[PDB]
Amino acid sequence: PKIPYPKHVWSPAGGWYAQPANWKQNTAIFGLVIFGITAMVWKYSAEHEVRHKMPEPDRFYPSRYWVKQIKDYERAQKEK
Amino acid sequence: PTPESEAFLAKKPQVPPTFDGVDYEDNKRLKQAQDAIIREQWVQVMMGRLVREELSKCYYREGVNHLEKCGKLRERYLQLLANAKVKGYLFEQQNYWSK
Amino acid sequence: QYDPPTGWLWGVRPGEKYQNEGWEGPFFYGFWGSLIVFAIAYAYKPDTSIQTWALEEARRRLEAEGILEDPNPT
Amino acid sequence: NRVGDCFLTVGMFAILWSLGNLDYATVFSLAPYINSNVVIIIGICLLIGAMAKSSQVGLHVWLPMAMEGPTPVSALIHAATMVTA
Amino acid sequence: MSLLYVLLIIPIIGIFLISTIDSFYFFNVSYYKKIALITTILNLIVSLIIYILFDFSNNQFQFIQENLDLSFYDIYLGVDGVSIYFVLLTTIIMPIALVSNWNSITNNIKSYLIIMLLLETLLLAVFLVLDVLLFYIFFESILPPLFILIGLFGSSNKVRASFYIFLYTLLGSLFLLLSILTMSSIVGTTYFDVLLKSSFEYTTQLFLFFGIFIAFAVKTPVWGLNSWLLRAHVESPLGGSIVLAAIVLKLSLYGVFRLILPILPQASLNLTYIVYAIGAITVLYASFSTLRTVDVKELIAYSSVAHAAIYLMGVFSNTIQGLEGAILLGLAHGFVSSGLFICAGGILYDRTGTRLIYFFRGLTQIMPLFSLFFFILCLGNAGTPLTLNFVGEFMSLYGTLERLPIAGMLASTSIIFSAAYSIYMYNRIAFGGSVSLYFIDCFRDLTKREFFILFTLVSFTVILGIYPSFVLDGLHYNISSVVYGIEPNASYLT
Amino acid sequence: NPPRIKRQFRDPHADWWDKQERRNFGEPVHEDHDILGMFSPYEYTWITPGKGLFQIGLFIASFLGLCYVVKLTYPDRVSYPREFEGGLERELGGAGAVRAFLCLDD
Amino acid sequence: NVEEPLGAAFYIAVGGIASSFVIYNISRPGPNGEPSSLHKWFSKISDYKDEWETRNTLMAAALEQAAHDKHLLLTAER
Amino acid sequence: HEIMIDTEFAVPVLFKLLPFIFTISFSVIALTLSELLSELVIYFKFSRFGYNIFGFFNQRFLIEFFYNKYITNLILNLGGQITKI
Amino acid sequence: LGAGSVIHAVADNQDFRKFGGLISYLPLTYSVMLIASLSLVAFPFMTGFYSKDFILESAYGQFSFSGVAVYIIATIGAIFTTLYS
Amino acid sequence: PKDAVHLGLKGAAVVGGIGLLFAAVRTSLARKNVGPWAIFTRNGKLAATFAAVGGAYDFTRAAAANLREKEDWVNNGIGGLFAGATMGLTTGRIPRVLGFAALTGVVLATAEYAGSGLRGVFKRDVDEYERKEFLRKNRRRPIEETLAEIGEGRGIKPPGYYERRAQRLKEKYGVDINPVCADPDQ
């Protein structure tokens, strides 16, 4: 069943069985925000990620494509 | 070394940090002495904050062999840790030791 | 099922709207307005803390040693 | 958990007192040279703090009746993650 | 004209503005609150201009004004590192205190607004005056406006409360006054710059320490002298309670930075074991009783006695960490204590007419917003991290422990015991059942007024909890001056 | 003052004005009402606490008894302490640190 | 059936976060460039190179002298 | 205090597989004591010696009993003495 | 999580005194909980086998009085681990 | 050395003599004729307590001084402490004895440590201008004076703290202080 509850009680988390008719576009609207500042974090993270041991070129390494501390090093190493 | 920036001109003490051979009635002088003694204790403490930054850099960079490659920075930190403490200018101002 | 979300924010019923007591204009434009503007000014307020001044000296202080190789040799 | 966090906080006061900081690189590089007795006093304090989170022989009364929460909570938190802090 | 004197006069314009409009425009009582609210916002703006100009690395008092008209009791004003955040706190709180009683004050609205505006001028002058006789002139001047405020707008037993706040303060201050008068007869003045550089005989310091400590132990308040606080912080109107727990309590903590630390160095260093005995006994007893307190306002009031001991032990720790955390603790205590009184004295008592916790249970079912903030405020009272209250408690406790291990350890029980009464109060009111069945009428949640005075108060305690460098940065250089001692290898450099 | 009894012992199925508290509407109250209600520390009632100390002690004695058995009968060490060439003096932080085993006593 | 608006709170938080990045970018003076025009203006108004010190020292002298005068008058022989 | 090499070599083979022996063995007694006999457990329950050992272990070694009565109720009465007397 | 689906199957009951059967009713739920319990009891060649069992050999590998003493304590605890499993 | 038993009677005669006239004033203000000999009929108790409190203040005050042979403020506190404790015994109540011993005990410690001006105060006999000038401009003091006052340590670590600390620890615990070299080199 469904528990009865007051209809006047405004909640920030929604209330008792809350779901708006527009739960999708609003979800999409919020989802863009999370992505927007995630890469915003990822940018700052990619810029401040500091390391001391460099990876071998052969080895699998996902961060070789965005981080700065080794991208400059890799092209600097590409000089001989 | 690194040239002194303009901000490090006004806040540089113009007088060596002591209360020896000074006049306490000259208010301009007493304050500068207090300021200068404060300036040195704070610089000394911040030397600790750089040797730790340098030490922490080695600690990651070596790991297993950290106890035998950057122990030279370690001793420097301990020596500063044992001495560099902001203790104020009031015990100096009120007591003279005179060797 | 899932019920449509409801509630009366500030206790204002759907028929009517919120009525001002007169504190709002001073609190949002004056109190909160001033602090936010103050926040803007602080990012421009020059750094005058004893740490910052002592960093520079101690940075020079270590440069006359092995640690902290100086960018410009004397 | 606060009962353990007092001992953890007092232990971190002992770390700040005897080393001047508590960054992991700084405590561990210097640890092989600090006084033996400060190692116990610091080590003991974090031992009590471990008991409260990881329920031990004395600091556990909170865990069996922590299961009053929904089971999803107990899986993530009270079986695998929070009690291994 | 000094910006500091601008701070002291704007509330006087407000008093003059409020009292003459009836001669100009049956003027609506809404207008006078509009003037009083705006007048405090102007003080906040000026204090914010002063902070944007303030220099964090200068020993000289800043924003002083030339007088050259020396009388026997002139008024000098100054702003250095220790006193600026106290001034900053006062000008932040006062607008919120007036908004907290926007509807609760019905009769004598002119009187209430005039007292609080007067009360603001007197409180700022305490942190701004530049000698110890001026300090006392303004730390005791608040008594008549506080006496009349309580007995004109107070709760049922306001008469007893007003007599307690006036007669404990007056007595403690008279013991302080006998010490300030002894100093002036030795030094020949009280001006901070002249007086600080005077030393004192050891016996003089011991007897000067008492009288001042009698005075500051009444106004802290330490346990056993705290009965005036339980009466005058509960029976007061909500705005007066906010001022009495966020501002008035912090004059004594600041009075250690002008009257005990720089001029009684030897005396403090030898009497700390008394102070830490009183402080630890205060934490320990003021926590157990507030665990058993039934009046919701009295529980919040008497937890301040618990926290005021922690930053009282931090200012006697002779440690740069303890002294700074002590200011941070008394700064954060002003936000969280203000909010908790708003929650108890302003949100529950307004709706229910009662303060007995017996009548409250499960308000989370009906008040989601109130439960939210009343939970962050309860966490801050418990010194939970991300809160400036935590940083102040942590830094004070390290300083207390580093100075006297057994006392700091017995102070360190506060982590266990402050969470005990802060969450036991939270689960009894917000949680613990569906709703109290003594409510024969459903309750509205937070209004927009309530939602915004709490949103500010928890905003300050949280932002300065992630980044306490906003306060810590300007505190460093000037609080270095109030330490006493030397290191064998760093003293007397030649 | 009514008899000082927790409400834990009050009938759950009895008619109560406040069932969640098990209290009648105008029911008289102890001066410890605040710590005698349903949201109070649960009062366990398995046995008298005098017997509880005795029963727990038997387990403690059993723990001590089992420990004594192992002490008298437990195998001696099999492997010698590891011998490290040079004693690992340098790698373990120098002479001012705990060193490895190198031709010492045993 | 009813719809929930994004709400003013959503715009304040997003706007505040978005504004924070914008304000931070203009706050940075530059890699090697001089402090910006706004960066110099604040330092200019709050300069007080020696204004407070000279003002303070003349004030303490004036009260030193007053303290001596009172010491003279109060301790005069009967 | 390295024990890694001794963990694999010096330990006798019986002790290495000993928990396996106990696991497969002690389980079947439980399988034997329930759904096969289902009487010995009942006989052991109702004995005076067996009654208390069931209750004592069920009730968590009476530890919370020793916690509520002599730790937290003590705090709740010290608060009572201070705020009344 | 296996227990959680069990609680959902019944009317959110949690007592063993009113549990039984359910072999045909919860085939998948039984299969996983057996898999988990076997690793919990350190059945050989499982996820919990290497992790839980190695401890005892590591405890016994340290050829000291304390190491052997807790080996018995751990083993008897492992015995009761089988029982509730 | 003072004759406490001989003194206390003199102390009793003085104070007890005052209560005699307060008794006589009570007899005079009486509204009923009782006669002249009523001074010791009902008013005798008033003078007796005046007699009792007085000498009990003096004997104990004297007997305290003879116990250790030194004259200072505190002896009058003990005698005052007893004189108040004697006041309660007339009423017959433990709180009164303690409430009274506390009151007149503290009063006669305060006025004896501070020199109640009821018989004048100490004459300066010196330059008052100089005394104020000296107490105000002695801004620096020798390091020995503070060390004798606050001790050493607790942040008072003067030059030479470490050299003497090593010796002090050795003479008490018999351990030679030698911090570890803490470095692979040197």
Side-chain angles (χ1 to χ4, degrees), chain A residues 2-9 15-18, chain C residues 2-6, chain E residues 365:
Chain A
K2 207 160 299 184
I3 313 289
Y5 57 87
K7 298 293 183 182
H8 46 100
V9 173
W16 272 260
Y17 298 87
Chain C
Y2 282 127
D3 289 339
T6 187
Chain E
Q365 287 200 323

mmCIF file with all atom_site columns, all heavy atoms in Angstrom, chain A residues 2-9 15-18, chain C residues 2-6, chain E residues 365:
data_model
loop_
_atom_site.group_PDB
_atom_site.id
_atom_site.type_symbol
_atom_site.label_atom_id
_atom_site.label_alt_id
_atom_site.label_comp_id
_atom_site.label_asym_id
_atom_site.label_entity_id
_atom_site.label_seq_id
_atom_site.pdbx_PDB_ins_code
_atom_site.Cartn_x
_atom_site.Cartn_y
_atom_site.Cartn_z
_atom_site.occupancy
_atom_site.B_iso_or_equiv
_atom_site.pdbx_formal_charge
_atom_site.auth_seq_id
_atom_site.auth_comp_id
_atom_site.auth_asym_id
_atom_site.auth_atom_id
_atom_site.pdbx_PDB_model_num
ATOM 1   N N   . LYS A 1 2   ? 0.223  2.398  0.348  1.00 0.00 ? 2   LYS A N   1
ATOM 2   C CA  . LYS A 1 2   ? 0.912  3.680  0.395  1.00 0.00 ? 2   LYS A CA  1
ATOM 3   C C   . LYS A 1 2   ? 0.549  4.388  1.690  1.00 0.00 ? 2   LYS A C   1
ATOM 4   O O   . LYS A 1 2   ? -0.635 4.536  2.008  1.00 0.00 ? 2   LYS A O   1
ATOM 5   C CB  . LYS A 1 2   ? 0.544  4.550  -0.811 1.00 0.00 ? 2   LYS A CB  1
ATOM 6   C CG  . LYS A 1 2   ? 1.613  5.553  -1.198 1.00 0.00 ? 2   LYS A CG  1
ATOM 7   C CD  . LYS A 1 2   ? 1.439  6.019  -2.632 1.00 0.00 ? 2   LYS A CD  1
ATOM 8   C CE  . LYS A 1 2   ? 1.542  4.853  -3.603 1.00 0.00 ? 2   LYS A CE  1
ATOM 9   N NZ  . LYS A 1 2   ? 1.479  5.301  -5.021 1.00 0.00 ? 2   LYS A NZ  1
ATOM 10  N N   . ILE A 1 3   ? 1.562  4.820  2.427  1.00 0.00 ? 3   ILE A N   1
ATOM 11  C CA  . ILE A 1 3   ? 1.325  5.481  3.715  1.00 0.00 ? 3   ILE A CA  1
ATOM 12  C C   . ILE A 1 3   ? 0.749  6.872  3.470  1.00 0.00 ? 3   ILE A C   1
ATOM 13  O O   . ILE A 1 3   ? 1.300  7.628  2.654  1.00 0.00 ? 3   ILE A O   1
ATOM 14  C CB  . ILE A 1 3   ? 2.623  5.562  4.516  1.00 0.00 ? 3   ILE A CB  1
ATOM 15  C CG1 . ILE A 1 3   ? 3.336  4.211  4.514  1.00 0.00 ? 3   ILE A CG1 1
ATOM 16  C CG2 . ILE A 1 3   ? 2.341  6.019  5.937  1.00 0.00 ? 3   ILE A CG2 1
ATOM 17  C CD1 . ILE A 1 3   ? 2.640  3.153  5.341  1.00 0.00 ? 3   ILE A CD1 1
ATOM 18  N N   . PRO A 1 4   ? -0.342 7.252  4.127  1.00 0.00 ? 4   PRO A N   1
ATOM 19  C CA  . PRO A 1 4   ? -0.812 8.635  4.021  1.00 0.00 ? 4   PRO A CA  1
ATOM 20  C C   . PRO A 1 4   ? 0.181  9.591  4.660  1.00 0.00 ? 4   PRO A C   1
ATOM 21  O O   . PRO A 1 4   ? 0.901  9.241  5.598  1.00 0.00 ? 4   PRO A O   1
ATOM 22  C CB  . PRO A 1 4   ? -2.141 8.620  4.782  1.00 0.00 ? 4   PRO A CB  1
ATOM 23  C CG  . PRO A 1 4   ? -2.005 7.490  5.736  1.00 0.00 ? 4   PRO A CG  1
ATOM 24  C CD  . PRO A 1 4   ? -1.184 6.451  5.028  1.00 0.00 ? 4   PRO A CD  1
ATOM 25  N N   . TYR A 1 5   ? 0.219  10.813 4.138  1.00 0.00 ? 5   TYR A N   1
ATOM 26  C CA  . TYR A 1 5   ? 1.185  11.799 4.595  1.00 0.00 ? 5   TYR A CA  1
ATOM 27  C C   . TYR A 1 5   ? 0.667  13.182 4.245  1.00 0.00 ? 5   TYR A C   1
ATOM 28  O O   . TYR A 1 5   ? -0.152 13.325 3.328  1.00 0.00 ? 5   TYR A O   1
ATOM 29  C CB  . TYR A 1 5   ? 2.558  11.556 3.960  1.00 0.00 ? 5   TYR A CB  1
ATOM 30  C CG  . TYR A 1 5   ? 2.536  11.563 2.459  1.00 0.00 ? 5   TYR A CG  1
ATOM 31  C CD1 . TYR A 1 5   ? 2.679  12.743 1.752  1.00 0.00 ? 5   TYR A CD1 1
ATOM 32  C CD2 . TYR A 1 5   ? 2.378  10.388 1.747  1.00 0.00 ? 5   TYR A CD2 1
ATOM 33  C CE1 . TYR A 1 5   ? 2.664  12.751 0.387  1.00 0.00 ? 5   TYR A CE1 1
ATOM 34  C CE2 . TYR A 1 5   ? 2.357  10.392 0.377  1.00 0.00 ? 5   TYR A CE2 1
ATOM 35  C CZ  . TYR A 1 5   ? 2.506  11.576 -0.296 1.00 0.00 ? 5   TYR A CZ  1
ATOM 36  O OH  . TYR A 1 5   ? 2.487  11.584 -1.667 1.00 0.00 ? 5   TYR A OH  1
ATOM 37  N N   . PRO A 1 6   ? 1.126  14.222 4.945  1.00 0.00 ? 6   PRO A N   1
ATOM 38  C CA  . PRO A 1 6   ? 0.662  15.578 4.641  1.00 0.00 ? 6   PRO A CA  1
ATOM 39  C C   . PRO A 1 6   ? 1.111  16.032 3.266  1.00 0.00 ? 6   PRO A C   1
ATOM 40  O O   . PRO A 1 6   ? 2.153  15.618 2.756  1.00 0.00 ? 6   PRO A O   1
ATOM 41  C CB  . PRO A 1 6   ? 1.312  16.436 5.732  1.00 0.00 ? 6   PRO A CB  1
ATOM 42  C CG  . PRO A 1 6   ? 1.857  15.494 6.722  1.00 0.00 ? 6   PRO A CG  1
ATOM 43  C CD  . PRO A 1 6   ? 2.139  14.223 6.009  1.00 0.00 ? 6   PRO A CD  1
ATOM 44  N N   . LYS A 1 7   ? 0.315  16.909 2.668  1.00 0.00 ? 7   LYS A N   1
ATOM 45  C CA  . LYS A 1 7   ? 0.625  17.448 1.355  1.00 0.00 ? 7   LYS A CA  1
ATOM 46  C C   . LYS A 1 7   ? 1.210  18.850 1.421  1.00 0.00 ? 7   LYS A C   1
ATOM 47  O O   . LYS A 1 7   ? 1.546  19.418 0.379  1.00 0.00 ? 7   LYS A O   1
ATOM 48  C CB  . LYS A 1 7   ? -0.627 17.445 0.475  1.00 0.00 ? 7   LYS A CB  1
ATOM 49  C CG  . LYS A 1 7   ? -1.186 16.053 0.231  1.00 0.00 ? 7   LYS A CG  1
ATOM 50  C CD  . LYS A 1 7   ? -0.243 15.215 -0.610 1.00 0.00 ? 7   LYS A CD  1
ATOM 51  C CE  . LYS A 1 7   ? -0.844 13.854 -0.914 1.00 0.00 ? 7   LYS A CE  1
ATOM 52  N NZ  . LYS A 1 7   ? 0.082  12.997 -1.703 1.00 0.00 ? 7   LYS A NZ  1
ATOM 53  N N   . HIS A 1 8   ? 1.354  19.411 2.613  1.00 0.00 ? 8   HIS A N   1
ATOM 54  C CA  . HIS A 1 8   ? 1.888  20.752 2.764  1.00 0.00 ? 8   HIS A CA  1
ATOM 55  C C   . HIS A 1 8   ? 3.384  20.775 3.024  1.00 0.00 ? 8   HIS A C   1
ATOM 56  O O   . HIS A 1 8   ? 4.003  21.834 2.889  1.00 0.00 ? 8   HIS A O   1
ATOM 57  C CB  . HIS A 1 8   ? 1.170  21.472 3.899  1.00 0.00 ? 8   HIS A CB  1
ATOM 58  C CG  . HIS A 1 8   ? 1.013  20.648 5.138  1.00 0.00 ? 8   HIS A CG  1
ATOM 59  N ND1 . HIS A 1 8   ? 1.838  20.788 6.234  1.00 0.00 ? 8   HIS A ND1 1
ATOM 60  C CD2 . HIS A 1 8   ? 0.107  19.700 5.469  1.00 0.00 ? 8   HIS A CD2 1
ATOM 61  C CE1 . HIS A 1 8   ? 1.455  19.954 7.182  1.00 0.00 ? 8   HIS A CE1 1
ATOM 62  N NE2 . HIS A 1 8   ? 0.405  19.284 6.745  1.00 0.00 ? 8   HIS A NE2 1
ATOM 63  N N   . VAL A 1 9   ? 3.980  19.634 3.356  1.00 0.00 ? 9   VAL A N   1
ATOM 64  C CA  . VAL A 1 9   ? 5.335  19.586 3.887  1.00 0.00 ? 9   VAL A CA  1
ATOM 65  C C   . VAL A 1 9   ? 6.307  19.632 2.711  1.00 0.00 ? 9   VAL A C   1
ATOM 66  O O   . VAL A 1 9   ? 6.523  18.638 2.022  1.00 0.00 ? 9   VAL A O   1
ATOM 67  C CB  . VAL A 1 9   ? 5.542  18.352 4.762  1.00 0.00 ? 9   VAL A CB  1
ATOM 68  C CG1 . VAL A 1 9   ? 6.978  18.222 5.163  1.00 0.00 ? 9   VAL A CG1 1
ATOM 69  C CG2 . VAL A 1 9   ? 4.656  18.433 5.987  1.00 0.00 ? 9   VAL A CG2 1
ATOM 70  N N   . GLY A 1 15  ? 10.096 14.711 -0.457 1.00 0.00 ? 15  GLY A N   1
ATOM 71  C CA  . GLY A 1 15  ? 8.870  14.404 0.244  1.00 0.00 ? 15  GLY A CA  1
ATOM 72  C C   . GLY A 1 15  ? 8.667  12.911 0.360  1.00 0.00 ? 15  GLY A C   1
ATOM 73  O O   . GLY A 1 15  ? 9.639  12.172 0.524  1.00 0.00 ? 15  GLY A O   1
ATOM 74  N N   . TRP A 1 16  ? 7.423  12.441 0.266  1.00 0.00 ? 16  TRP A N   1
ATOM 75  C CA  . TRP A 1 16  ? 7.180  11.034 0.556  1.00 0.00 ? 16  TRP A CA  1
ATOM 76  C C   . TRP A 1 16  ? 7.387  10.148 -0.664 1.00 0.00 ? 16  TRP A C   1
ATOM 77  O O   . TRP A 1 16  ? 8.302  9.328  -0.677 1.00 0.00 ? 16  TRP A O   1
ATOM 78  C CB  . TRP A 1 16  ? 5.781  10.849 1.138  1.00 0.00 ? 16  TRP A CB  1
ATOM 79  C CG  . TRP A 1 16  ? 5.797  10.996 2.595  1.00 0.00 ? 16  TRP A CG  1
ATOM 80  C CD1 . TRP A 1 16  ? 5.812  10.004 3.518  1.00 0.00 ? 16  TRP A CD1 1
ATOM 81  C CD2 . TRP A 1 16  ? 5.850  12.223 3.318  1.00 0.00 ? 16  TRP A CD2 1
ATOM 82  N NE1 . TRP A 1 16  ? 5.850  10.534 4.780  1.00 0.00 ? 16  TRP A NE1 1
ATOM 83  C CE2 . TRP A 1 16  ? 5.875  11.899 4.684  1.00 0.00 ? 16  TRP A CE2 1
ATOM 84  C CE3 . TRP A 1 16  ? 5.864  13.567 2.940  1.00 0.00 ? 16  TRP A CE3 1
ATOM 85  C CZ2 . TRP A 1 16  ? 5.907  12.862 5.671  1.00 0.00 ? 16  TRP A CZ2 1
ATOM 86  C CZ3 . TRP A 1 16  ? 5.898  14.521 3.918  1.00 0.00 ? 16  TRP A CZ3 1
ATOM 87  C CH2 . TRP A 1 16  ? 5.916  14.169 5.270  1.00 0.00 ? 16  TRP A CH2 1
ATOM 88  N N   . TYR A 1 17  ? 6.594  10.322 -1.712 1.00 0.00 ? 17  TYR A N   1
ATOM 89  C CA  . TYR A 1 17  ? 6.806  9.468  -2.874 1.00 0.00 ? 17  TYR A CA  1
ATOM 90  C C   . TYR A 1 17  ? 7.086  10.328 -4.091 1.00 0.00 ? 17  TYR A C   1
ATOM 91  O O   . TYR A 1 17  ? 6.500  10.127 -5.159 1.00 0.00 ? 17  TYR A O   1
ATOM 92  C CB  . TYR A 1 17  ? 5.605  8.554  -3.100 1.00 0.00 ? 17  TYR A CB  1
ATOM 93  C CG  . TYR A 1 17  ? 5.357  7.610  -1.949 1.00 0.00 ? 17  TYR A CG  1
ATOM 94  C CD1 . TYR A 1 17  ? 4.585  7.995  -0.868 1.00 0.00 ? 17  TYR A CD1 1
ATOM 95  C CD2 . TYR A 1 17  ? 5.896  6.337  -1.945 1.00 0.00 ? 17  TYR A CD2 1
ATOM 96  C CE1 . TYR A 1 17  ? 4.363  7.146  0.182  1.00 0.00 ? 17  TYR A CE1 1
ATOM 97  C CE2 . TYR A 1 17  ? 5.678  5.477  -0.900 1.00 0.00 ? 17  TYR A CE2 1
ATOM 98  C CZ  . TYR A 1 17  ? 4.910  5.883  0.160  1.00 0.00 ? 17  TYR A CZ  1
ATOM 99  O OH  . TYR A 1 17  ? 4.688  5.024  1.209  1.00 0.00 ? 17  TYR A OH  1
ATOM 100 N N   . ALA A 1 18  ? 7.991  11.282 -3.928 1.00 0.00 ? 18  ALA A N   1
ATOM 101 C CA  . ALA A 1 18  ? 8.131  12.369 -4.880 1.00 0.00 ? 18  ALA A CA  1
ATOM 102 C C   . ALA A 1 18  ? 8.692  11.896 -6.213 1.00 0.00 ? 18  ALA A C   1
ATOM 103 O O   . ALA A 1 18  ? 9.714  11.210 -6.267 1.00 0.00 ? 18  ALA A O   1
ATOM 104 C CB  . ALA A 1 18  ? 9.031  13.450 -4.301 1.00 0.00 ? 18  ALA A CB  1
ATOM 105 N N   . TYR C 2 2   ? 4.400  6.556  -8.193 1.00 0.00 ? 2   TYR C N   1
ATOM 106 C CA  . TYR C 2 2   ? 5.215  7.608  -7.598 1.00 0.00 ? 2   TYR C CA  1
ATOM 107 C C   . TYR C 2 2   ? 4.413  8.898  -7.607 1.00 0.00 ? 2   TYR C C   1
ATOM 108 O O   . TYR C 2 2   ? 4.010  9.371  -8.675 1.00 0.00 ? 2   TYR C O   1
ATOM 109 C CB  . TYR C 2 2   ? 6.527  7.768  -8.360 1.00 0.00 ? 2   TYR C CB  1
ATOM 110 C CG  . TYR C 2 2   ? 7.538  6.703  -8.023 1.00 0.00 ? 2   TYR C CG  1
ATOM 111 C CD1 . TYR C 2 2   ? 8.136  5.948  -9.018 1.00 0.00 ? 2   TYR C CD1 1
ATOM 112 C CD2 . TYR C 2 2   ? 7.848  6.411  -6.707 1.00 0.00 ? 2   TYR C CD2 1
ATOM 113 C CE1 . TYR C 2 2   ? 9.049  4.962  -8.716 1.00 0.00 ? 2   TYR C CE1 1
ATOM 114 C CE2 . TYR C 2 2   ? 8.761  5.428  -6.391 1.00 0.00 ? 2   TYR C CE2 1
ATOM 115 C CZ  . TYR C 2 2   ? 9.357  4.702  -7.400 1.00 0.00 ? 2   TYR C CZ  1
ATOM 116 O OH  . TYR C 2 2   ? 10.266 3.716  -7.092 1.00 0.00 ? 2   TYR C OH  1
ATOM 117 N N   . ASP C 2 3   ? 4.181  9.457  -6.429 1.00 0.00 ? 3   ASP C N   1
ATOM 118 C CA  . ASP C 2 3   ? 3.305  10.607 -6.300 1.00 0.00 ? 3   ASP C CA  1
ATOM 119 C C   . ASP C 2 3   ? 3.984  11.872 -6.814 1.00 0.00 ? 3   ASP C C   1
ATOM 120 O O   . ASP C 2 3   ? 5.201  12.028 -6.686 1.00 0.00 ? 3   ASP C O   1
ATOM 121 C CB  . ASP C 2 3   ? 2.895  10.800 -4.844 1.00 0.00 ? 3   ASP C CB  1
ATOM 122 C CG  . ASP C 2 3   ? 1.945  9.725  -4.360 1.00 0.00 ? 3   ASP C CG  1
ATOM 123 O OD1 . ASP C 2 3   ? 1.295  9.080  -5.209 1.00 0.00 ? 3   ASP C OD1 1
ATOM 124 O OD2 . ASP C 2 3   ? 1.853  9.521  -3.131 1.00 0.00 ? 3   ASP C OD2 1
ATOM 125 N N   . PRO C 2 4   ? 3.221  12.785 -7.405 1.00 0.00 ? 4   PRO C N   1
ATOM 126 C CA  . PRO C 2 4   ? 3.784  14.075 -7.799 1.00 0.00 ? 4   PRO C CA  1
ATOM 127 C C   . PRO C 2 4   ? 4.294  14.822 -6.583 1.00 0.00 ? 4   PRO C C   1
ATOM 128 O O   . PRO C 2 4   ? 3.651  14.810 -5.521 1.00 0.00 ? 4   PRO C O   1
ATOM 129 C CB  . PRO C 2 4   ? 2.593  14.801 -8.441 1.00 0.00 ? 4   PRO C CB  1
ATOM 130 C CG  . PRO C 2 4   ? 1.392  14.134 -7.863 1.00 0.00 ? 4   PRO C CG  1
ATOM 131 C CD  . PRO C 2 4   ? 1.783  12.698 -7.702 1.00 0.00 ? 4   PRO C CD  1
ATOM 132 N N   . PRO C 2 5   ? 5.438  15.491 -6.693 1.00 0.00 ? 5   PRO C N   1
ATOM 133 C CA  . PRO C 2 5   ? 6.013  16.159 -5.524 1.00 0.00 ? 5   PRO C CA  1
ATOM 134 C C   . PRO C 2 5   ? 5.221  17.404 -5.172 1.00 0.00 ? 5   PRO C C   1
ATOM 135 O O   . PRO C 2 5   ? 4.833  18.188 -6.040 1.00 0.00 ? 5   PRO C O   1
ATOM 136 C CB  . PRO C 2 5   ? 7.438  16.507 -5.972 1.00 0.00 ? 5   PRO C CB  1
ATOM 137 C CG  . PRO C 2 5   ? 7.484  16.265 -7.451 1.00 0.00 ? 5   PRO C CG  1
ATOM 138 C CD  . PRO C 2 5   ? 6.137  15.849 -7.932 1.00 0.00 ? 5   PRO C CD  1
ATOM 139 N N   . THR C 2 6   ? 4.979  17.576 -3.876 1.00 0.00 ? 6   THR C N   1
ATOM 140 C CA  . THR C 2 6   ? 4.165  18.674 -3.386 1.00 0.00 ? 6   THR C CA  1
ATOM 141 C C   . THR C 2 6   ? 4.751  19.176 -2.076 1.00 0.00 ? 6   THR C C   1
ATOM 142 O O   . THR C 2 6   ? 5.689  18.596 -1.524 1.00 0.00 ? 6   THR C O   1
ATOM 143 C CB  . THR C 2 6   ? 2.706  18.250 -3.193 1.00 0.00 ? 6   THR C CB  1
ATOM 144 O OG1 . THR C 2 6   ? 1.917  19.400 -2.866 1.00 0.00 ? 6   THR C OG1 1
ATOM 145 C CG2 . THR C 2 6   ? 2.598  17.242 -2.062 1.00 0.00 ? 6   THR C CG2 1
ATOM 146 N N   . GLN E 3 365 ? 9.316  14.831 10.740 1.00 0.00 ? 365 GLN E N   1
ATOM 147 C CA  . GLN E 3 365 ? 8.180  14.487 9.897  1.00 0.00 ? 365 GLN E CA  1
ATOM 148 C C   . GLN E 3 365 ? 7.452  15.704 9.357  1.00 0.00 ? 365 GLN E C   1
ATOM 149 O O   . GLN E 3 365 ? 6.717  15.579 8.374  1.00 0.00 ? 365 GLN E O   1
ATOM 150 C CB  . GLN E 3 365 ? 7.178  13.608 10.641 1.00 0.00 ? 365 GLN E CB  1
ATOM 151 C CG  . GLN E 3 365 ? 7.608  12.192 10.860 1.00 0.00 ? 365 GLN E CG  1
ATOM 152 C CD  . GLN E 3 365 ? 6.435  11.298 11.138 1.00 0.00 ? 365 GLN E CD  1
ATOM 153 O OE1 . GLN E 3 365 ? 5.487  11.695 11.807 1.00 0.00 ? 365 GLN E OE1 1
ATOM 154 N NE2 . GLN E 3 365 ? 6.483  10.081 10.616 1.00 0.00 ? 365 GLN E NE2 1
#
